[PDB]
């Protein structure tokens, strides 16, 4: 993957970045050759935090006046790391008249429960927690509608337990709503 | 003019603060590099630039308990109604009315954020255009603020006959 | 003749002094805003420790009539004659018929127009002078517009009595210019060495018995605090202080206890919510003969940060002290005491291991 | 006369208290941001443990009318008479006609404007006072704008009753200054020893002005029990781990916090416990050197790798340490 800090502005003085869906579109429009290899039941083979990518980004309209690339092969389980992730802890329930509900004890401790489930065998670590976004499309046809997503910002220190598994987590993403700002997991050596 | 973009900032931003916490926390840290996290929300609608960015950030740094009239009338009505100190808010008004464009934004946050504390109504659009009016007529806007305050205080006291 | 004391003292998340709106007071000094503790507040803390430690207590009050009325009531007077007698005490002073009085408060004696700053035993003597004229007061209480009866010279001579706090900080009374005493101590506004942004902590108050709407609402007020390493400075003009107290020995005790109090006390501003008690990281007393010299310009360039400011602040006060002793040559006796051992700090003179040793030694070094 | 207790306590993945947006509260201290647990939260947890352990429970509530109304309804009053009587109890106090009330909420009695901090049995006495005037209440419920009938002085005397929690932390109610109690305990904001970009080793500090506490409770043995139980609550409880190090000192001249000891943020990469204990030791020695005093010190730690000499005589366990120095005061 490769990491870059880009900035999006609004093209005129009337706001013709107002909504999340337009953020998705603006993000995808800055990558020409795109591919999507999907499998049923698991996740998909970019990710973003309110940017990691496979293809070379080139600046577009109303952006920076200038255009790093990393692979985790260089240089261990047991080590503590810096962390931040914005995700959406959820539960799937039956609704009268299915559905997605945020309460998965509801509160910090349920969120840590959400952590042991989401991390599983990967890395046991310090997820800063809070349990507590609305959006609607600008009108473009067949392009989603309006709704609400609840994001979270976890920060802390992790220990690694299975390098290749951590690689799977870092590149696939952890949790729903990756397309609305969530998913990107950042670790750093202490 | 200016007031049109100001209203766009008040609705748009009024929704992002009460709606999304990460943006609310990223813009409130700038009430300079340290505020660049805020441009991503406010930069596209913008002396006026300093006005917009500051008022949006300060507007955003309020407690949740707080989430065409001017600021002087809002202060006088806050004194008469909420019972704030009158004589002391008086000297702070008299100190802001003398500041320059850079001084208003450094003396302003305590009174406005504290005024919104204890749920005082504040029309942010007029305040924005006012902070924009410091670039051309600082003394004029200052005089309007003070006059509005005393006149509305007097009328509110006389109408309590 | 000028004992001046410098000190570096950090305070963590203190918020020692609030404006009327709760923000810590700030100075935009050197182009950058830095929170400060007002000189008058800390001066009050110092004066309370000095009066408490030296035993003589001064009273700065606007309602002296009420207190004198309380003493006359404990002297066996009925409440109305005590009130009238104390009114005579304050009526008997000033150029005009008497000291101007604030609007009368229901059930209590009126407060005087100006604040009084006098020792407690002086109040007791005023009660005694008002006591020996009981019959004149008894006849005089009946008239509609009572006039002053007490001798003006005796009472005015009583109001001139000086406390240690009065000798040290001075007093002012516009209506009685004979009693005004010039203060002998200068107390600078302690500001932070580094730039500090006010950090606001949102706090809420839990209602103990559960209610569904209110708990869910979760609506609360915001409280602003700040933290940082304050620079502190103070002067004592010894010759004028000796003229005020009169004796040099009483001036010496006043100075030793004042300096020690200066190190020991902390203004106590929202200290139950936060414990800001702390000893100064560095102290540098100097006995200057020509003039007192503050080292505030040393910190006009705000410190950048990222690393602990205490050590860098001590080193900056050191280099600036060396450069001033070079630029302004003098025979002033310097001296310091510090907790850190990482540096020698050569310019601050001979080092003493402890604060009381430093204070006692240099004050003994001045007389 | 000033018992002050210092403690270093790491907390693993606690994130006990969040701001309004969920991030842990942080201090930019020493120029670097360090996450902190606010003093008010820990003060509340500690007071709840103290009330729970000593059996006396205090109640800080804005809706006293509703609770007293519930008790009077259990005393045999009709619901409307219970509501009217409780409204009279809170209306009959204060300088002006009565304590200000918030706009009425549907199905329940209105909440008072200011929060009340009084013991539960005090609520029971208020119910009894409202009970003994049943005829006055029955006649007084019919008028359109009812005034207070109950004696104001006696009610203020019931509101003056102090719990252990009130004696220890103090209370404030602006309308009745006769009841105000100055707190005897200072509670510092626990910040991390090291800079943190959550978990970490918080430094914690607190003072107990024993003399003011003795004046509040009045008797010295009850003050002793109050102090011991308070210290024990401070160590044992977690806002929802045992502290790695505890250092109580009995200062006679003045309380001295060791927060400057950690003004230099710790670098990291290695376990902060060892470096923190050594730094608090070194700073304690240097302060005892700079400020000579006869304050009785003492500490207790789990690790035996060091014998922090400056922290006085070492005690093997938390209860032994607390008991020895509290008994020494």
Interfacial B residues in 45-104 facing C (CB < 8 Å): 61-65, 85, 88
CB D198 within 8 A of CB D35: yes
Residue of A177, A116, A120 lying closest to A147 (CA atoms): A177
The residue in chain C having the minimum alpha-carbon distance to the alpha carbon of residue B87 is C20
Rounded to whole angstroms, the maximal C-alpha distance in chain C is 77
CB-nearest partner of C310 from D61, D263, D291: D263
A79 in the same domain as A136: yes
- Chain C residues lying within 8 Å of D253, measured CB to CB: 264
Mark out chain A residues that contact chain B at CB-CB < 8 A: 7-15, 17-18, 50, 86, 132-134, 151, 153
Please state, in angstroms and rounded to a whole number, the distance separating the CA atoms of residues B129 and B47. Answer: 11
Q: How many residues in total does chain A contain? A: 190
D77: Cβ contacts below 8 Å, ≥ 6 apart: D85, D131
Q: A32, A51, A72 — which closes off a domain?
A: A72
Mutate to test the interface with D, among C273, C351, C356 (most CBs of D within 10 A): C273
Q: Which two tokens stand for residue D294?
A: 């006869």
Q: What are the φ/ψ torsions at residue C229 (nearest 5 degrees)? A: -95, 100
Residues A148 and A167 in one domain: yes
Min Cα distance D17 → chain C (Å) is 10
| A56 and A112 housed in the same domain | no
CB pairs under 8 A between A and D: 35
Q: How far apart are CA B38 and CA B23, in angstroms?
A: 8
Tokens of C246: 């009169």
Q: Chains B, D: CB contacts under 8 A, how many?
A: 8
Closest by alpha carbon to D2, among D297, D299, D253, D292?
D253
To the nearest whole Å, the CA of B26 is away from the closest chain D CA by 11
Neighbours of B (≥3 Cβ pairs closer than 8 A)?
Answer: A, C, D
Same domain, A23 and A80: no
Number of domain units in chain B: 1
Quick one: A53 and A26 in the same domain?
yes
Query: Apex CA D252: angle with CA C54 and CA D320, to 5°?
Result: 170
State the resolution, in angstroms.
Answer: 3.8
Interface of A with D (CB under 8 A): 82, 108, 112, 126-132, 152-153, 155-157, 190
- Cα gap D158→D173, rounded to integer Å: 14
Q: How far is D253 from chain C (nearest CA, A)?
A: 9
Which residues are registered as beta bridge partners of D266? D194
Rounded to a whole number of angstroms, the CA Rg of chain D reads 24
Please list every residue in chain B whose beta carbon sits closer than 8 Å to the beta carbon of residue C220.
Answer: 63-65
Nearest to B110 among C19, C220, C221 (CB): C19
Rounded Cα distance between C67 and C88, Å, is: 14
Tell me how close the Cα of C43 comes to any Cα of chain B, in angstroms: 23
Domain that holds residue B18: 1-161
First-to-final CA distance of chain D: 8
- Contact present, D191 and D29 (Cβ < 8 Å): yes
B20 contacts in A (CB within 8 Å)?
Answer: 133, 151
Residue C69 Ramachandran class (φ > 0 left, ψ -120 to 50 alpha, else beta): alpha
Instruction: Work out how many CB contacts closer than 8 A connect A with B.
Output: 34
Half-sphere CA count of D295, side-chain side, radius 13 A? 27
CA–CA gap between residue C11 and residue D170 (Å, rounded): 24
Whether the Cβ atoms of residue C23 and residue C224 lie closer than 8 Å to each other: yes
Closest Cα of chain B to D58: distance in Å? 26
The parent domain of residue A79 ranges over: 73-190
**Chain interruptions in chain D, by residue before each (C–N > 2.5 Å):** 197, 240
Shortest CA distance from D206: residue in chain C: C275
Nearest-neighbour CA in chain D from B95: distance (Å): 30
Specify which residues A189 forms β-bridges with. Answer: A81
> For D22, which residue in chain B has the nearest alpha carbon?
B21
Determine whether the interchain pair A7/B22 forms a contact, defined as Cβ–Cβ distance below 8 Å.
no
> Rounded CA gap, B90 and B105, in Å?
18
CA A63 to chain CA centroid, Å, is 22
Quote the tokens at residue A18.
């107002």
Residues of B in contact with A19 (CB under 8 A): none
What whole-number distance in Å separates Cα of residue D65 and Cα of residue D123?
10
Are residue A87 and residue A170 in the same domain, yes or no?
yes
What does the DSSP assignment read for D17-61? -B-TTSPBPEEEETTEEEEEE-HHHHHHHHHHHHHHHHS--EEEE
Residue C259 · residue C50 · CB < 8 Å:
no
Residue B44 with chain A: CB contacts under 8 Å: 9-13, 15, 17
D221 interface with A at CB cutoff 8 Å? no
Widest CA span in chain B: 53
Whole-Å CA distances, C295 to C8, C36, C264, C303: 11, 16, 21, 15
Report which of A12, A17, A50 is spatially closest to residue B46, judged by C-alpha positions.
A12
- Dump strand ranges (E) for C159-261: 185-187, 190-192, 199-202, 222-225, 228-237
User: Subunits touching A (CB < 8 Å, at least 3 pairs)?
Assistant: B, D
> Which residues in C lie closer than 8 A to residue B65 (C-beta atoms)?
219-221
Nearest CA in chain B to C219: B65
DSSP state of D109: P
Question: What is the rounded CA–CA span in Å between residue B31 and residue B27?
Answer: 8
Same domain, A113 and A127: yes
Q: From the list D18, D21, D199, which residue is nearest A157 (CB)?
A: D199
Q: Which DSSP string corresponds to A125-154?
A: E--------EEE--S-TTS--EEE---EEE
The pair of structure tokens assigned to D293 is 């005093």
Same domain? For A60 and A89 the reply is no
Q: Which residues pair with D299 in a beta bridge?
A: D247, D314
In our burial notation (b when 16+ CB lie closer than 10 A, e otherwise), range B13-39 reads beebbeebbbbbbbbbebbeeebebbb
Most D CBs within 10 A among B16, B19, B20, B21, hence the mutation to make, goes to B21
Q: How far apart are CA C63 and CA C318, in angstroms?
A: 48
Compute the residue count for chain B.
161
Please report which residue ranges of chain D form alpha helices under DSSP H: 39-54, 64-74, 79-91, 120-132, 134-140, 152-159, 164-169, 210-217, 220-236, 272-290, 318-328
Q: Helix (H, G, I), strand (E, B), or coil: what is residue B30?
A: coil
Instruction: Compute φ and ψ for A123, nearest 5 degrees.
Output: -125, 130
Neighbours of A102 (CB within 10 A): 16
| Min Cα separation B133/chain A (Å) | 19
Give contacts of A50 with chain B, Cβ < 8 Å.
22-23
In 3D space, the residue among C257, C267, C271 whose CA is nearest the CA of residue C230 turns out to be C267
**Contacts with D276 (C-beta within 8 Å, 6 or more apart), sequence order:** D8, D193, D201, D203, D245, D262, D266
Kindly list the partner chains of chain D, i.e. chains with 3 or more CB atom pairs below 8 Å.
Answer: A, B, C
- Specify the DSSP class assigned to residue D112: B
Helix (H) or strand (E) holding D201: strand D200-209
Q: How many domains does chain A have?
A: 2
Are both A66 and A80 inside the same structural domain?
no
Given an 8 Å threshold on Cβ–Cβ distance, is B110 in contact with C21? yes
DSSP string, D114-142: S-EEEEHHHHHHHHHHHHHTHHHHHHHTS
CB–CB of B61 and C23 under 8 A? Answer: no
d(CA C27, CA C37) in angstroms, rounded, equals: 10
Which of A34, A50, A72 is a domain's end point? A72
Distance CA C216, CA D294 (A): 51
Helix, strand or coil, per DSSP, at residue C301: coil
CA distance A143 to chain D (A): 31
Provide φ and ψ at C223, rounded to 5°.
Answer: -115, 125
Query: Quick one: A58 and A127 in the same domain?
Result: no
C33 in Cβ contact with C257 (< 8 Å)? no
Of C250, C99, C87, the closest CA to residue C166 belongs to C250
- Specify the experimental method: cryo-EM
Q: CA of C206: how far to CAs of C209, D26, D190, in Å?
A: 9, 22, 20
Same domain membership, residue A173 and residue A113: yes
* N-term to C-term CA, chain A: 22
Residue C199, φ and ψ in degrees, nearest 5? -100, 120
- Helix boundaries (H) for chain A: 20-28, 108-119, 163-172
Same domain, A105 and A190: yes
Question: What string of H, E and C letters represents the secondary structure of C138-163?
Answer: HHHCCCCCCCCCCCHHHHHHHCCCCC
Q: Treating both helix axes as pointing N-terminal to C-terminal, what angle do C248-264 and C39-54 enclose, rounded to 10 degrees? A: 120
- Could you say which DSSP state residue D173 is in? -
Cβ within 8 Å, pair B63-C222:
yes
Q: CB distance from B34 to chain D under 8 Å?
A: no
Tally the residues of chain C: 367
**Residue of B93, B52, B59 lying closest to B75 (CA atoms):** B93
Closest Cβ–Cβ partner in A15, A133, A151 for B44:
A15
From C35's Cα to the closest Cα of chain D, the distance in A is: 13
Instruction: Determine which of B62, B63, B86 to mutate to test the interface with C (most C C-beta atoms within 10 Å).
Output: B63
Give the CA distances from residue C319 to residues B39, C299, C341, C345, C347, in Å, rounded to whole numbers and listed in that order: 42, 11, 17, 8, 7
Query: Around Cβ D122, how many Cβ atoms within 10 Å?
Result: 19
Chain A residues within an 8 Å CB radius of D23: 128, 130, 153, 155
Tell me which chain A residues have a C-beta less than 8 angstroms from the C-beta of D15: 108, 128-130
Boundary (domain end) residue, out of A30, A45, A72? A72
**What's the rounded Cα separation, in Å, for the pair D152 and D140?**
17
């Amino acid at each position: 993957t490769w990491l870059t800090k880009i900035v999006p502005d609004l093209r005129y003085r009337q706001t013709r970045f107002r909504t999340a869906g337009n953020l998705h579109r603006k993000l995808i429009r800055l990558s020409s050759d795109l591919g999507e290899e999907r499998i049923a039941n698991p996740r998909q083979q970019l990710l973003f935090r309110i940017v990691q990518s496979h293809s070379p980004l080139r600046v577009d309209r109303l952006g920076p006046g200038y255009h790093r690339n990393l692979d985790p092969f260089l240089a261990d389980k047991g080590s503590r790391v810096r962390y931040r992730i914005v995700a959406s802890p959820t539960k799937r329930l039956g609704r009268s008249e299915t559905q997605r509900l945020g309460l998965k004890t509801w509160r910090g401790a349920a969120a840590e429960e959400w952590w042991h489930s989401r991390a599983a065998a990967n890395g046991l670590e310090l997820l800063s927690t809070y349990a507590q976004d609305d959006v609607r499309d600008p009108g473009t046809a067949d392009r989603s509608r309006k709704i609400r997503h609840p994001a979270v910002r976890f920060d802390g220190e992790a220990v690694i337990s299975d390098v290749d598994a951590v690689r799977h987590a870092v590149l696939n993403g952890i949790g729903r709503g990756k397309s609305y700002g969530c998913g990107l997991l950042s670790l750093a050596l202490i | 003019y200016i007031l049109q973009h100001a209203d766009a900032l008040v609705k748009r931003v009024s929704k992002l603060i009460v709606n999304e916490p990460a943006a609310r926390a990223a813009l409130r840290r700038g009430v300079d590099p340290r505020m660049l996290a805020a441009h991503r929300v406010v930069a596209p609608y913008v002396a006026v630039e300093r006005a917009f960015y500051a008022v949006a950030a300060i507007m955003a740094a309020q407690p949740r308990s707080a989430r065409r009239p001017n600021l002087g009338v809002s202060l006088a009505q806050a004194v008469f109604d909420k019972g704030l100190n009158a004589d002391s808010t008086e000297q702070r008004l008299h100190l802001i009315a003398r500041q320059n464009l850079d001084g208003v934004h450094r003396h302003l946050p305590r009174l406005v954020l504290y005024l919104r504390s204890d749920q005082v109504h504040i029309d942010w659009g007029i305040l924005i255009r006012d902070l924009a009016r410091w670039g051309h007529t600082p003394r004029h806007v200052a005089r309007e603020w003070v006059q509005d305050y005393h006149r509305t205080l007097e009328t509110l006291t006389r109408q309590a006959e | 003749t000028f004992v001046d004391i410098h000190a570096i003292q950090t305070l963590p998340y203190s918020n020692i002094n609030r404006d009327d709106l709760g923000s810590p007071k700030t100075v935009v000094y050197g182009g950058k805003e830095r929170t400060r503790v007002s000189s008058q507040s800390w001066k009050r803390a110092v004066r309370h420790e000095v009066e408490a430690r030296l035993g003589d207590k001064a009273v700065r009050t606007r309602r002296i009539i009420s207190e004198i009325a309380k003493r006359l009531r404990e002297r066996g007077w009925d409440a109305d004659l005590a009130d009238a007698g104390a009114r005579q005490v304050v009526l008997s002073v000033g150029k005009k018929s008497g000291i101007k009085l604030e609007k009368e408060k229901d059930s209590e004696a009126p407060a005087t127009s100006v604040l009084f700053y006098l020792p407690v035993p002086a109040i007791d003597e005023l009660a005694a002078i008002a006591d020996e004229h009981r019959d004149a007061v008894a006849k005089e209480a009946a008239k509609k517009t009572p006039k002053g009866i007490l001798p003006a010279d005796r009472i005015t001579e009583v109001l001139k009595s000086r406390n240690v706090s009065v000798n040290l900080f001075g007093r002012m009374l516009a209506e009685l210019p004979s009693t005004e005493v010039d203060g002998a101590v200068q107390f600078a506004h302690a500001f932070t060495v580094h730039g500090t942004t006010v950090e606001v902590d949102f706090f809420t108050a839990v209602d103990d018995i559960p209610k569904e709407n209110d708990h869910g609402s979760g609506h609360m007020n915001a409280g602003q605090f700040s933290a940082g390493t304050f620079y502190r400075y103070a002067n004592v003009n010894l010759d004028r202080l000796v003229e005020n107290t009169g004796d040099a020995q009483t001036a010496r005790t006043a100075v030793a206890e004042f300096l020690r109090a200066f190190l020991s006390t902390v203004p106590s501003g929202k200290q139950n919510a936060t414990a800001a008690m702390t000893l100064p990281d560095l102290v540098h007393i100097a006995v200057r003969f020509d003039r007192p010299i503050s080292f505030a310009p040393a910190f006009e360039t705000a410190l950048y940060g990222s690393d602990g400011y205490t050590l860098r602040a001590c080193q900056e006060l050191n280099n600036y002290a060396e450069r001033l002793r070079e630029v302004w040559p003098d025979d002033a006796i310097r001296g310091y005491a510090t907790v850190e051992n990482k540096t020698d700090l050569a310019a601050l003179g001979e080092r003493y291991d402890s604060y009381p040793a430093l204070i006692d030694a240099m004050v003994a070094a001045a007389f």
